[PDB]
Structures are given as C-alpha cells and as structure tokens.
Nucleic acid binder design. Structure first.
Lengths: 217, 456
DNA sequence: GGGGTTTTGGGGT
DNA sequence: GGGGTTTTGGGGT
DNA sequence: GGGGTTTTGGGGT
C-alpha cells in the first residue's frame, strides 16, 4: 500500500524507471525535510526510516556558506536540514568499498541547495537503517539487474547451441571440463556484467573531507 | 580452587566474587556500546531457579568486555556456561550477575548435546564431554570435582527442556500481532526457507504458531547455523512498516537467532505443528513483478540432507578442487535466465538409442523415442556480478530428470495440452525472483538435472 | 590485591 | 550499562 | 608498566 519512507519510494521509483529521474512522479520532487544522523566521516541523513548519503555540489556548499556564515556543515549532527533543490542519479560503483550501494549500483541524492533549521527540531523515530541493506530495496535492485541481464542474454545468445546429446548420453570413455558450460552473457570488456541501458549520470560532487578542510584545515 | 554456588543460593549481601555453572536460555549477540566497550546480556537457569510458578524464572547475566572476541556467542539455548568472579546484585527484582571480562572475570561454554553448534556445522566430534567449546582468555582449566557438576547439570538441562517449554509464551510475541508493538519484541518460529539473497546475506522465511509468514535478513557470517525446518528464537526484532510487498522483520546488531538443544519440547512440537506455507508464492505468481522469492522446485527426499554447491564452485573450481573432483552428484540453487531451444515446441526431440542422435519432430517421428533435451542458462548469488551465464542440462534420454516438468515427454507439435503446460512453466522459470533447487549429475563436463521436480 | 609480565619496585585512581 | 544502537569493520560487532 | 580497583604503596613470579 502506502510507502511511509520518502527515500525508499524515491529510490525505488528511480530504479523502476531505468535511472531516468524525469520519469519519476512529479508529486515526489518537493522539498526534503530530513534529520542529520552523522556528519563526519560520513554525512548521513534520515527520513525517519532509512539513512542515505547526500552528495553536495560545489555550488551547494558555497551557497550554504554564504546564506549561513559560520554554521559549519561537518557539525550538523543531530540537527535538521531542508533540501530545496535536489536531483537523483544512478552510478556504477564498487559495493565492496561504498556501503551506500548494492550490487555495484548506487542511487545518489544530488543536493543543490539546503538550509539548516537548528530550531530545536525534533521527531521521535525508529532506528534509521541503511536503505541499501533493506530486503525489499535490495530486491528492487536485483529486479533491475535481472531485467538488464535477461535482455542482454537474449540479444547475445542465439542459434540454440545445445550440447550435442551424444556428448552426454554416451559419456563412457569421455571426460570433460566443466568450464565448457560457461556462456558469455553480453558483449562486455571484462569479467563484470555492465550491459545496462540507463545513462549513468555524471555530476561533480565534493568529497566529505574537502568540506572539512574548507572549514577546519 | 573454585567453589561453585547455585543461582538461588548466591549471596546478595556479600558483594564478593562468586562462581557458578548454569544453563543459558537466552542471549543477545555480543554488541558494542561506544568506543571501548562490548556487552552481552543473557538469561540463565539452574536447579534452584528455573521456573516462576509456571512461566520460566531466571537470573540475568551481563558480561562486559573491551573486545568483541572476549564475549560468548550463543547460537543455541540449552548449552551451559561456567562463570568465574561475578558480583551479584538485585536489579529491579531480578538476580543479576555482572562480570567484567576485561578485568578478572571469565566464562567457558559447554555443549549439552553431543556436539556444539559449530561442531555440527563442520561435522567434527567433540574432543571430550569435559571440554569447553568456547571460552575467554588464553586458557581454561576444569578440575576433577567439576566433572560431576557438569554431567549433572547436562542431565538436568535435558530433563528441563524436554518437560517444559523454557521459552514461555511471555518471552515472545505472535507474528500476527507484531505490527501492534511499540518497540522491539521476540519471536519463536520455524525456518521454512533459507534464501541466499547475496554473497553476504541469507533471507529467512519464518512462520510461527499463529500462522503468519514473515521474512528477515540474516547475515551468513553472524548466523551460520540457520537451517530450513528448524525452530529458532529471535531475540529482538521490530516490525518493518516500510515493507509493502512483504512482511519483514528488522534485526539489530544486538539481535540474536537462537536454536534449541535436541531435547527441547517446544522446538519438537513447533517442528511438527508448523507446516510449510506456499500462499506467499502462489499469490506472487499472479503479479508481473514479485519482490518475494519463489523456489519452484523440490528435490527428492533422499538428497534433502545433501549440502549445496554454488555455481562458482561448480563451473570454476570443480576441476581443480580436491573435494569437488571426487563427487559426481551435487545439489545447487540458481535462477534461469534463458531456456534453449527458444521454441518450447522443440524441447522434446526424437532420440535414436543406437546412433545416439536426436532430431526435431518436424514430420512427426518414429525417428526415436520422445525425450526432453532442454538447456538452461543459469546464474546465482556467487556469480551475480560476473558476465557469465551457465549451462545446466535436462537431457532425459537415460531417465535423469524425466519428471522435471510433471509432463511426460511427448510431441509438443501435436499435444497442445503438454505444450501449454511447458509454455507456462517456461515463463515461470525465466520470471524474476524464481529459483530452482536441484540435484545434478556430472557427465563429460556437463551437469544434468536429476531427482528434481517442479512444484508449481 | 593480584594478572601477566618483567616492571623484578613503583604511578595514577 | 542491563530489553540494548558500533563503524579495529559501516554485510558478525 | 599499566588496567582495573581500591590495594591508594607494595607481592610473586
């Protein structure tokens, strides 16, 4: 029924629309009011159910540092922020190194403008969990890959190259190597499957440590 | 020399270190609280403190440490723990034993059953019935006079678990009432299925006495003892209100999944009473996209106890690993990406036993006996990220996998009924989140499905 | 006082 | 600090 | 020496 998690609904709709942010429902592109769980070494904000990592543009922090002098970003822990201008992108990453991702895919929250509300902002919430560790969400991403994988395999594998029945039915005096059952899924370059059709968004962003040196060298 | 005292007889006044043996009936996983501290909380029992006048009574044990490795991991309820130097104090009416492992306190775990959980998983025998399977510090010493204390407590541990539920109705919440809790709760259920979601996570399919089915993520490394058909107690779960497609439980770093020792009366009754449910699967087959995994097949009873082998091992290591080379029959799980030949009508070919050749039923044969010659292109958790898809065969000319489709081989160009049932099975097998549990036999470098059949 | 360690008598709390 | 909330690791903590 | 504990300066190993 109704999805309580703003983030989960947003990120799920993005993946269910091949990473196209223009195909995601317009009634969901309203300002995001979220609680800041951590600010360093990782900046993580919650929507009351999950936590995701926002990716700030150089423009976003400079604008911030102007309209709100001396109010450091890396010290926003336990305070709220309102993201007025933001976009969602899909990026290929190394899930073994990035914890805010799954199956080498990440949905990024690109922040263009955000204002802090220190006004004793509250809200009794459940413990926030990594959206990329959620059962249903992991499943949504698996669906995404399964669709890309199946489309690539039905395009790549043709001609019904079936193992000759004699090779198996009359296997006495016949030895074989199992790697004969290995079939390439797509026209890739390396050992990883990368035949996707969503155009990987680019957009430059700041490393959380640069915003820490900019405020406290 | 250590003097062991019984739980109810331990002194509340003399804040001096005391020692005791006891049976563990519940425990959190060891968890971190800040930067230099780890805690493990457990409920203990013995002949002098095991039952309120019906619901189970117990003392509590809180172990403090500076390292994760210095705290006990309780995978099973019913085993025994021996603690040295605990201080006892009353905490909200209950007798609470506190022990700082980081200072001078220590613990040792003893198996009530023949083997410990870990020994069962790795099929090892126990060194002896007086050996601790886990303990704190570099050493553990058990004196001759402790042997009787241990053997007697084991005897008692079994009597206790076989005649009482131990984990009484007040220590958990019915799954169909889970959504009504304000915070976390405990659950006692049967594992109906263990699905390998990915390289690090299992997804458990649970069902309790109330009949509700729930799913929950279970890390492979943390809970390596989960097994289908077994009953467990989940210590600390919360209801996930963000899961719309399926009922999900969220566990925390302090949560724990606990099994029961063989003599457990509760585990035995729940194992028999709670029967398999496929309602979640049948309902999901009506949807275009199912966030619920559906295991479409069932292996023959004689293989139910055979361990599974990943596709990674099956196709990339089977000709190099000593253990995999000596075997020719395996059990594995996977999802089908494509089925060849494309035309469902050509799945059944005519086979000539003498020339060892098969042919299409074009001008409809006599060319040979009808057989299935199907080639599945599969993939699994262990190969999720690579650019490969693997060939798994269903070549039934010698009888292997003849009943896989619950449709005896026939000319699919003429038998509309057979063709339709196979076409429907084809869509089901290639559908996202559909998986196959199968036993395969290795012949001339290929794997042929055998002793496996569809259940949908 | 007592562990393990080596400090083999002596800080700080 | 115990019926709880880390990050030596953010997929045992 | 240094923790944790309290022994709050000093044992044994």
């Amino acid at each position: 029924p109704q999805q309580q998690s703003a983030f989960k609904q947003l990120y799920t709709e993005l993946f269910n629309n091949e990473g196209d942010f223009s195909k995601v429902s317009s009634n969901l592109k309203k300002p995001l009011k979220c609680y800041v769980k951590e600010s360093y070494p990782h900046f993580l904000v919650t929507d009351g159910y999950f936590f995701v990592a926002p990716y700030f543009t150089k423009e976003a922090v400079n604008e911030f540092h102007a309209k709100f002098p001396n109010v450091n970003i890396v010290d926003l822990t336990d305070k709220v922020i309102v993201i007025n201008n933001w976009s969602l992108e899909l990026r290929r990453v190394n899930s073994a190194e990035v914890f805010t991702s799954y199956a080498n895919l990440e949905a990024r929250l690109i922040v263009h403008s955000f204002k802090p509300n220190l006004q004793e902002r509250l809200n009794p919430t459940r413990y926030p969990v990594n959206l990329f560790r959620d059962d249903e969400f992991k499943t949504t991403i698996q669906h995404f890959r399964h669709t890309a994988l199946q489309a690539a395999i039905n395009k790549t594998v043709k001609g019904d190259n079936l193992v000759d029945i004699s090779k198996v039915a009359d296997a006495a005096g016949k030895k074989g190597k199992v790697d004969a059952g290995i079939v390439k899924a797509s026209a890739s370059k390396g050992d990883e499957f990368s035949d996707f059709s969503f155009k990987e968004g680019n957009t430059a962003t700041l490393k959380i440590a640069d915003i820490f040196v900019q405020e406290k060298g | 020399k250590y003097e062991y005292v019984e739980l109810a007889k331990a002194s509340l006044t003399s804040a001096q270190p005391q020692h005791f043996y006891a049976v563990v009936i519940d425990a959190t996983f060891p968890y971190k609280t800040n930067q230099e501290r780890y805690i493990c909380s457990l409920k203990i029992v013995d002949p002098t403190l095991y039952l309120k006048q019906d619901a189970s009574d117990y003392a509590t044990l809180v172990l403090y440490a500076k390292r994760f490795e210095d705290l006990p991991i309780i995978h099973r309820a019913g085993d025994i723990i021996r603690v040295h130097r605990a201080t006892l104090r009353l905490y909200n009416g209950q007798r609470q034993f506190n022990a700082n492992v980081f200072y001078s306190s220590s613990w040792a775990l003893f198996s009530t059953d023949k083997r410990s959980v870990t020994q069962e998983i790795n099929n090892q025998d126990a060194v002896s019935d007086t050996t601790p399977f886990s303990f704190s510090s570099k050493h553990a010493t058990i004196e001759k006079n402790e042997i009787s204390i241990l053997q007697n407590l084991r005897k008692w541990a079994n009597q206790y678990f076989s005649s009482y539920s131990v984990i009484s109705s007040d220590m958990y919440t019915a799954l169909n009432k889970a959504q009504a809790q304000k915070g976390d709760f405990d659950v006692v259920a049967k594992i109906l299925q263990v699905h390998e979601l990915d390289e690090y996570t299992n997804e458990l399919k649970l069902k309790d006495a109330s009949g509700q089915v729930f799913y929950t993520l279970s890390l492979k490394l943390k809970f390596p003892h989960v097994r289908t058909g077994e009953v467990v107690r989940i210590r600390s779960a919360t209801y996930d209100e963000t899961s719309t497609q399926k009922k999900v439980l969220i566990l925390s770093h302090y949560s724990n999944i606990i099994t029961f020792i063989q003599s457990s009366k509760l585990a035995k009754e729940l194992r028999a009473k709670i029967q398999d449910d496929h309602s979640v699967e049948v309902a999901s087959l009506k949807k275009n996209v199912s966030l619920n995994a559906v295991v479409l097949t069932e292996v023959d009873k004689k293989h139910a106890a055979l361990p599974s082998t990943s596709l990674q091992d099956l196709f990339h290591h089977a000709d190099s690993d000593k253990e995999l080379q000596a075997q020719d029959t395996f059990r594995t799980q996977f999802y089908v990406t494509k089925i060849e030949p494309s035309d469902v009508k050509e799945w059944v070919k005519g086979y000539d036993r003498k020339t060892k050749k098969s042919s299409s039923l074009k001008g409809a044969s006599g060319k040979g006996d009808n057989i299935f010659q199907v080639q599945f292109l599969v993939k699994d958790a262990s190969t999720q990220l690579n650019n490969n898809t693997y060939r798994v065969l269903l070549y039934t000319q010698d009888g292997l996998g003849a009943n896989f489709f619950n449709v005896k081989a026939d000319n699919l160009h003429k038998n509309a009924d057979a063709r339709k049932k196979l076409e429907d099975s084809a869509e089901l097998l290639t559908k996202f989140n559909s998986y196959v549990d199968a036993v395969v036999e290795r012949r001339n470098g290929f794997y042929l499905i055998k002793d496996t059949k569809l259940i949908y």
